[PDB]
Amino acid sequence: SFVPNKEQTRTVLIFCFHLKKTAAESHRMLVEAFGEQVPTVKTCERWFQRFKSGDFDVDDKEHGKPPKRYEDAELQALLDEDDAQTQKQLAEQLEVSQQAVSNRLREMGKIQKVGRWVPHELNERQMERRKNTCEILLSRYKRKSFLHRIVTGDEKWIFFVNPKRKKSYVDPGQPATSTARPNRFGKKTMLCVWWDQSGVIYYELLKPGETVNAARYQQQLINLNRALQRKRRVIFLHDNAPSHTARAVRDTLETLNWEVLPHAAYSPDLAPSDYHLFASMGHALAEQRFDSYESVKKWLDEWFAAKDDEFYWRGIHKLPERWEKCVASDGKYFE
Amino acid sequence: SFVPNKEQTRTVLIFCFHLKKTAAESHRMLVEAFGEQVPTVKTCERWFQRFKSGDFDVDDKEHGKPPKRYEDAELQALLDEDDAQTQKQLAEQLEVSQQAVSNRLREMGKIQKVGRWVPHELNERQMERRKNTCEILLSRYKRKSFLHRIVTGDEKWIFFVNPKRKKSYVDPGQPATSTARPNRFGKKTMLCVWWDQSGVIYYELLKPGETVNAARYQQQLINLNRALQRKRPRVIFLHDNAPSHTARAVRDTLETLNWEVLPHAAYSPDLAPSDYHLFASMGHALAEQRFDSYESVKKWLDEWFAAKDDEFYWRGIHKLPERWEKCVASDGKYFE
DNA sequence: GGTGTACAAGTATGAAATGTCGTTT
DNA sequence: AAACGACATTTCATACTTGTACACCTGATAGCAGTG
DNA sequence: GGTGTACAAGTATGAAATGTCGTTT
DNA sequence: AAACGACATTTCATACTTGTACACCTGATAGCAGTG
DNA sequence: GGCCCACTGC
DNA sequence: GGCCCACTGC
Ligand SMILES: [Mg+2]
Ligand SMILES: [Mg+2]
């Protein structure tokens, strides 16, 4: 009460062949073993031909199949036109189903990736405006590194709670751990902070209802210089905010005698405070909660000092790497 | 020419056995065929034992293997404690590697899902406050459906651009189509809109710098009644507990019109038809939409309301008591 | 509330594998 | 006997189809301060 | 760059499979 | 001869390991209007 | 003197 | 008859 499959049967024909048996001889032995279920003599005679040309492959040669409605490169053509396109959209153009393409994208090497966020929709001018700033700063950097003289800063919000969506490992069809959504008008503090390649220099922490006026910003610049003179020419870089563009402050920047660096609009990607310093903070801020304003300050103090010096230096000195990219992108958002 | 593998060799022993051959006879035939590469007589004798107990499995019985460091349910225990946990965190508790767990989660049925967002962190009171509203409305619905008499509305923002992140199909290591982030202070319009199970009734479209005061909201309620009287036949009003809505000023106007206000708990957009149904549908139709002007918005709305079935609006209103039951089953909590 | 992707099971394709039977070696 | 040639008949991976599970979306809380 | 998940290639486990050789049927 | 028993020897899926590719995160644009 | 109104970038 | 709270929910 054993029935052999196709493969096992063909192996036995290899065996008989190597035993110098004749085609029909073998067939009679197959029946002596397995009864009448086995193949005709004619197929035994055929396999013997294949063995006489040393083809001991037991698997079938690949059978007929329906021809393809479209080809791999006919789909590839559509992805080069437009990377981000729904499977039903592609399917309509190829005149096949959604499910059809689903497979072919995995028969090809493809995967789904998510569209990276960028700060702004740029003008044709805004680009070349950006491209020039970078170009001109690269010229000057090559003549001499002035990055050891750079002091920068920017202002940024810090919420007392920073919820993030959880990710649960659970059987399919089960729900995940839901999270309670952040109050866009919950408790928060504007952090004004300026820093050298050495470390942080000085910073303030504004309670909401203390707006940033040019009048405030100067007062911060004085207390900045106070700190800078006792903690350490100077080269200033900061975003083109209206408190920063204030004529009031541009006088104060001459009086201090700090050279303002040229900076194009909408370039937080070229603002060390933004791309490096605050970015690091973003991770350390996840799922954090604070009682009070001194709970924030206390956390900051520990967290700044906890970093290397090599940290701060690194983010400042990454500038000219980025300036080159910016120039290579004709002013566009590189990366 | 040809050397046979383990499986092919064992098949031939099945063949010899069925040919009533002796163990050692078969072995001699194996060598006659394939030369001296084949197994000993002793293994042939063994396989014959297995065939005598009808075991014609050719694959090995599964070999020895290193014993498990932890068991499936020892990991399962940790996921019941805390669904959302990183592989390195679990790995530390089991005293195994991250990569180890990666596998065992797929050896088990598991997958990673994202934590659904909910409107608010609720109090113990806020829950039962909500649970009662639902409970009391279910009592009344059972006595008679009053949902054909319901007129509800809410206010919501509409941005002139609504960017969404693209998703690219591309070889691994290639970038995806990046897309430019929305300006939180770009052009926008507050949409104030009220609607019956029939369709939309009336709506206004505020330019920013026209705040919603109780004084405005009454003016909208009048123009609402103006519009409503030019359609239909009592009325039952439902709207979110905003301060313009809670205004004593407006609560007088709601008696004067003689519209019964429905009780509604705080922080329940999940029990607000305008929110969960009407606006939600709009959210999709608003993706990657751009507008020139305010009439561009109105024009799009007009087409888009009328384009819907009646069956649409009705559905969302009548889905209420389904949700009230869930709310009660959750002891007031956010039934996802 | 609506959309997008993948798994499942059904269905044609069509050349390779198989079977039938008079003829050749 | 044993193999063959020419014909009809059948097998099965393939490249699609329609039906459908289910992950994840969607709705949920209004800016400022400069300059001209 | 920081974190989290999955794909490599190397390495032990250990019982099932194999081999050797005097002994039993 | 053929099969066996008792012993030494070897095979291989398995359940881990460390090394590493790479997807996706992170930073970027300040509320209102009631009531007591 | 004042206020407004329309750009500008954070 | 005017304005600054600390609450509140969208
Ligand atoms: Mg800034
Ligand atoms: Mg509302």
Numbering used by the authors:
A (entry chain A): 3 to 234, 243 to 345
B (entry chain B): 3 to 235, 243 to 345
What does the paper say about this structure?
The Mos1 transposase homodimer binds to the IR at one transposon end and then captures the other IR, forming a paired-end complex (PEC). After excision, the Mos1 transpososome locates a TA target integration site and, upon binding, forms a target capture complex (TCC).
This DNA contains the transposon IR joined at its 3' end to an unpaired TA dinucleotide and target DNA. The refined Mos1 STC crystal structure contains a transposase homodimer bound to two DNA duplexes representing the products of transposon integration. Target DNA binds in a channel between the two catalytic domains and the active sites contain the strand transfer products. The transposase subunits adopt a crossed (or trans) arrangement with IR DNA in the Mos1 STC, similar to the pre- and post-TS cleavage Mos1 PECs: each IR is recognised by the DNA-binding domain of one transposase subunit and by the catalytic domain of the other subunit, and vice versa. The target DNA is severely distorted from B-form conformation: the backbone is bent by 147°, with the apex of the bend at the TA target dinucleotide. The aromatic ring of each F187 occupies the space vacated by a flipped A1, forming a π–π stack with the adjacent G2 nucleobase, stabilising this conformation. One Mg2+ was observed in each active site in the Mos1 STC, coordinated by the D156 and D249 carboxylates, the 3'-OH of C-1 and a water molecule.
